[model samples]
Structures are given as C-alpha cells and as structure tokens.
Target: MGPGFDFAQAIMKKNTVIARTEKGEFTMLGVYDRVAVIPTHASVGEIIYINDVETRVLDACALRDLTDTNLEITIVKLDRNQKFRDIRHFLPRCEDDYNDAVLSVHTSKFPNMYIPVGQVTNYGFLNLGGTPTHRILMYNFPTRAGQCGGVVTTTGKVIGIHVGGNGAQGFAAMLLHSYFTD
Candidate 1:
C-alpha cells in the first residue's frame, strides 16, 4: 500500500485522489472534507500519501485559479478518523455544465489497463502565467507522463482538472464553483 492507489471500495466514488509524492511524480489530488486539490507541481510543503494517512501541505492557493489558471490549490490535515469520504461528487454545478462538451481524462495511474480516453480538440486561453485565463480544456490526445492533477469527465459529469500536458497538447482546468458560499 505504500505504492499508493488503494482503491477498491468501488473506486471510493471517484473524483480521483492519487497524491502519493514518491519524491516527484505521482499527483492526482482533488477530493473533499479534509480538503485536497492540486496544480502548480505539487510542492508547497510536500509530503503526501492520502489514504496511506501521512500528510503535510497545510495550505496553498491560486485563489482557485479564477484568473491565475495554474489552479494551484492544496490542503491536508486528516489526523485519522478516516470516515470523511464525501469527496464532494465533484460537487459542481458549473459553467453551463461545461460550455458545450466532449470530455474524458480520468486517467489516474492504470490499474491494469488504462484509457480514460480524451478527444477535445479546442477551447482556449492558458498562459500558465496569467492575468488572463480564458477557460482552457484543449486536447488532441497523446497524453502520458504525469499529466498534471486530475480526472475530468463529461456524461459522468465533473468538468475538469488536469493541469499540464504535451504528447500533442493538453490542458484542463474548469471546475469553477463560485468560491463555496456566504
């Protein structure tokens, strides 16, 4: 179980969580309750391993990337009770259910065979260092190598999260939920 990915109880109801920082690569964090979300290449305090229970990274923010686009977010502090698994159901009500869709990138380290299948051809603006972040979700398929932080969906409904790319071109970061509430 040290090699991370201990998912069996029915995928723990997917929204993805594979945050075991085996030094550098291995990141797919976006869960609930004890808060977890990622972007901007891990590091902010490092030390990860979600279901393995050991934690670190107490805080980080791209202010939800609203205009930052790197989408950088991090939070962890689950001492041990362990029952907090809502994972929010991607809990989103977002941008027109994804401003016109055709998505699927749920690839979190293959269990045996892997293929979440993506085909989105375009939807622009991602300067990575931005004052402008025009909602990106571009893909041309050729993804491998760490693929950033996420697992986007469409009919299964969870707009976006993958934050890095290149095997052709890739980028996903849409899940906007209006900063929680008042």
Candidate 2:
C-alpha cells in the first residue's frame, strides 16, 4: 500500500469528543482538541458537558442566512480556572476545492471504539422548504448513529459539523459558510 489511508486517523481519534446537553446530545468536532464548535440545534440543554466533564458555554448563537435560515454554532469556553492542555490549535480554513478529501472524526458513547475518517465529496447549499441550508455530502462512511455534531476536517482544519445522517451517506453543516444573522 502507498502509505495507506490512516495518516489522519490518529488525530481524529484523539481529538473527537462527546458534547452532551440535558435534553439530548451530539458529538463535537473539537477544535484544538479542546473546545467544541457545534450546531445550535444540538445545544438542547442548559448545562453542557464535554467527555462527561461539566463545561461552560462561552458563546452561542444562531447563524443567519440570506435565505432566512437558522444555523447554530457554539464555542465552549472554559472558565479562567479551568484548563485543558491537550488541545493544540483549531483547524484553519481552506478553499472550497479542498472539501472532496476531508475527514470526518467522531466519538461514540463507548470508548475504544474507533470511527475512521471518510472523504467529503460535496459541500454546498440544500433547500429546506423555503429556506436554504448549508450541507455536506460524503461516501464510504458508516452511519453516524449517535455521532451527530461530529467534526469534519480537511488537512487539519475544520470544514463542517455532523448534523444529519442516514446510512452510507450523511450531511453536515458547513462551518465556513455559516454566519450569525443577529
């Protein structure tokens, strides 16, 4: 094999985290392997938890779309006293052309389970009734199960947040294109 496809596997495994809310929960595509930047719809509860440890929400907002779409993104802000040294740096941005080779990192409820990185073939606008929503398309990936809110990265930078999935293919919220209306 030509180096194999596991180059980015370890990084994804180490960085992926579980983001929990009171009503429901989702995966956090961690940035800098520390903070979770997830969709607002996934922020269902008052108190947020990361990897079973209670964490504080530093920022939360619903992104505004010219199409009147509402997309949420939250950055978990730790208190001054709190510290997580493992995280290094958040993923950097890339041109839209890089989306095809991206990787999706996710963490299941149980530890030791590994979900390999998959390719992002498409990322763009999807119409939801009257509104236009941002989305991603991928292949050869397993069902996300409980891994929604998972992070999608390309060459070490975040690209999207796992939101909805069915079977072999799923959709994520494209982060770079999202903006806060308010």
Candidate 3:
C-alpha cells in the first residue's frame, strides 16, 4: 500500500477499472492486468503510534506465515462520543453509527481482522501527539507533517499505514489498552 494515489485515481478516471455485470465480471477497459506490491516492515527506528510513541508491528509477511509470535492488542474503552470522532479522522467516508465502540480483535489465527476504532457516521475532532509537549490538553499542540504507520501491538500482531493529526494527545486514539495494562 505504498502510493497508489494517481494510479488508482487514473484507473477510476479512465473507467478502465474492473467491474461486474449481470452476465459475469470483466474489466471495463477490456484489459485485465494484475499487479502486486511487496510490503516490508518499517525501519527499526520507524515510529508508529498515536502519541508519537515509537513502536513496531509484527513483520507483515512473517505474521501472515504464522511466525512464532502472535500478539494481542488491548484497547481501552473510550466514551462513545470520543470513539465516533476517531473514525471520522481516517475514513471519513465510512458509516459513522456504531452501537458498540469497544475495540475488538480476533483471538485465533483466522484472517487478521481489522480492529475498528469507531464508526464514522458523524464528524468529530482528533489530534496526534508529537514531541516538545506532554500531552493533548496542554495547548502547544503542533501541526505536523510526515508519513507514518499505525501499530496495534509491538509483538508484530497488528498494524496499518495512517496519516494526519498533529502530535497532540488526540494521538491517544492510536493507543491500544495493552500499553497501560498491568
């Protein structure tokens, strides 16, 4: 998932992307092209967290291969309003209404399930915490730049690429409960 920005948009733009019809499935462009991207782990120094807490994810390929370590992410239960706000930041296009906001992950080796932070039927505010500051409520929240990924655990259990949000406390949105548990 490096950078499909223009390519995906271009395919959609040309109306050449794949689609399905009543008869069967086919590429509207009449060209069937299949491509794959090889994903890699971020450098050891790479950071992935809500509050700029440098963390790493289980190597994607290794994790998929059922490597020795299987991680479990524990996320704190946030107020429903706060949860709704979290989802709005990343996938603004997603549905917002969720009856339950508790973050959950699959316990077994079934497919790696995406832990939904929140639904996005409504809009809300969120921030990312960087350095030179203690936490969110402080006020010196800085507008930030750069690309980073999100990790649910260090044991290489779960993670995904994400951006936006300054280095403020709102980054807590990325904190899975495990980091704080005893």
Give each model's whole-structure lDDT: 0.50, 0.53, 0.22
**Stretches of candidate 1 above 4 Å error?**
1-17, 20-51, 63-113, 116-118, 125-134, 138-171, 174-182
lDDT of 2 at 47: 61
Best by TM-score: 2
For residues 18-114, what per-residue lDDT tens digits would candidate 2 score against the true structure? 6677646566654442344676666444467776787666555456556665544555543324344343343333335343334344445644333
lDDT rank order: 2, 1, 3
* Poorest stretch of ten by lDDT in candidate 1: 1-10
- Report the CA-based lDDT of candidate 3 relative to the real structure: 0.22
Q: Model 1 residue 161 lDDT?
A: 61
Candidate 2 has what TM-score? 0.65
**Cα RMSD (Å) between model 2 and the true structure?**
4.7
Task: Give the C-alpha lDDT of model 1.
Answer: 0.50
Residue 19 in candidate 1, Cα distance off native in Å: 3.6
RMSD to the hidden true structure, all candidates: 15.3, 4.7, 20.6
The per-candidate count of clashes, in order, stands at 0, 2, 12
Worst 10 residues of 3 by lDDT: 30-39
Q: Of 1 and 3, which scores higher on TM-score? A: 1
